[PDB]
Structure formats: C-alpha cells, structure tokens
Structure 1
C-alpha cells in the first residue's frame, strides 16, 4: 500500500488527471478502513510497476475529499475510475453499470488485461470498450 501514493486534496486529483497525457490515470475512490477497499489496494499495488509505462495509479479517500461524491455519484466502499486526456472512460464488465468499476477483481492477470484493453481501445478515442471477461454473475 505504501508503494502507491495518495491524493490529499481534490486539487491534487484534478491536476493529476490533467498532467498525465500519455497514460491512463487510474483512481481508487474509497476509505482506508474498508474490507474491500484494502483488498483492491493490494491487487493494484502489485500491478502498478508492471504497468508503469501505460498506466498511472493513485489513491483517494471519500472522507478526505468528498467534493467528488455527487458529480460522479459514489456509493459503496470503492470505485475504480479511469481517465485518459480528461475524458472519463467507460467499460462494460457485464455488470450493468458501465461507469467506473465496483467489484473486486480476482487475479492479477485479469486485472492487467482490463487496463490494457481500456488503454488500447481508449487510444483510438473509443468511449466504450469491452472487458473480455464479463463478471455480471460475480457482482
């Protein structure tokens, strides 16, 4: 967890989305105490190095910055939200909400595919992508 940095103001969130031109900006929105927001914080931290060349990761806490709760509508322990060139990206995991991510993904590998898929599709301006594995059943 101490690998991955944290964002302590909503102004750290916004500049961080802007200044990274060439890579995804992946953010976990959720709060330290949570059962499920700790688990994801692991599965990302392990992956963050492998992917440094196309994706950048950060951590944010709903309690630290609540400014973003209404606009993106944040419910539940945590939401993974992908950004490329200020454009909110979007993917269908078969789960019935195409915005963000909720459920906890299981393998390191299946997580890297999703990041890679989003980036590759995203690079072409495509706003939707399809997660190869569709965990509607899972979540």
Structure 2
C-alpha cells in the first residue's frame, strides 16, 4: 500500500498516463488509510512485479489530487482505472459500471487476468474489453 509509487498532483497523473506507450497504466484512486483501499493496494502490491512487463501501477490520493473527482466520478472509497496510450480502457465487469473497479479484490490472479485482458484489448485498439469473470454476484455459497 505504501511500497507503490504515488502521484501528488494532476499533472503527475497526466504525465504517468502519457509516459507509458506499451504498458497499461493502472491507477488506483482513493486513500491509503481506507480499509478497502488497503486491501486493493495489498493486492496490487502482490502483483506489481509480475505485471511489470505490460502494466505499471500508481496510487493517487483523491483528496491530495482532486482534479479527477468530477471527471471520473471518484466518489467511492476505492477505485481502480485502466489507461493505455492516453485512452481510458473501459472493462465490462458485469457490475453495471464499465469505467472502473470500485471495490476491492481478494485474488491476485483475478486482478492479473483483468490487467492482461485490458492490455490485449487495448493493444488490438479497443475501448471496451469483456472481463473474463462476471461480477453481477459475489459467488458466495
């Protein structure tokens, strides 16, 4: 949660999105002190080395950097968004919101699969990718 790089103003976020031309820019919008953000950041930290070939992970504090709250509807405790070549890559998670991951995941392989799907779809030149797993339900039994 604290081992990941941080972006401290909107210009830094724009540059991080613009800098990467061959990798998915995974940016988590939230607060390091929020428990949901702590879970999501732990998951991202567990996979940060694995996906470094095709993904880069940044963390942004939405109070320190409020320049995207109105734009990206960052009014949730945690939010993960995907950008590839200065384009926001939407993902059809099945949750009704195709723009972001607004909850916290528990499986590293889940997040890695989502990142890989986003990377492949964005490389092919697509603005929306279909998630390998549906999230219309939590699969709790």
Please state which band the TM-score falls in when normalised by the shorter chain.
Answer: over 0.9
Residue aligned with 1:120, SS: helix
State how many pairs are aligned: 139
Contact 2:92 2:98 in 1 (8 A): yes
Residue aligned with 1:11, SS: helix
Contact 2:78 2:104 in 1 (8 A): no
Rounded to whole Å, the distance in 2 between the matches of 1:37 and 1:106 is 12
- Moved segments of 4+, more than 6 Å: none
Rounded to whole Å, the distance in 1 between the matches of 2:35 and 2:87 is 30
Rounded to whole Å, the distance in 1 between the matches of 2:68 and 2:128 is 23
Task: Compute the TM-score of the two structures, normalised by the length of structure 2.
Answer: 0.94
Q: 1:38-84 CA distances to partner (integer Å, 9 max, x unpaired)?
A: 11010000100001000001000111111111111111101101000
Rounded to whole Å, the distance in 1 between the matches of 2:32 and 2:2 is 12
Per-residue deviation, 1:137:
1.0
Over 3 Å counting, the alpha-carbon distance change for 1:2 and 1:33 in structure 2 is closer
Task: Compute the TM-score of the two structures, normalised by the length of structure 1.
Answer: 0.96
Residue aligned with 1:39, SS: helix
Cα RMSD, aligned residues only: 1.5
Rounded to whole Å, the distance in 1 between the matches of 2:45 and 2:32 is 14
Alignment gaps of 5+ in structure 1: none
Per-residue deviation, 1:32:
1.9
Rounded to whole Å, the distance in 2 between the matches of 1:32 and 1:46 is 16
Alignment gaps of 5+ in structure 2: none
Q: 1:11-34 CA distances to partner (integer Å, 9 max, x unpaired)?
A: 110011101111000000001221
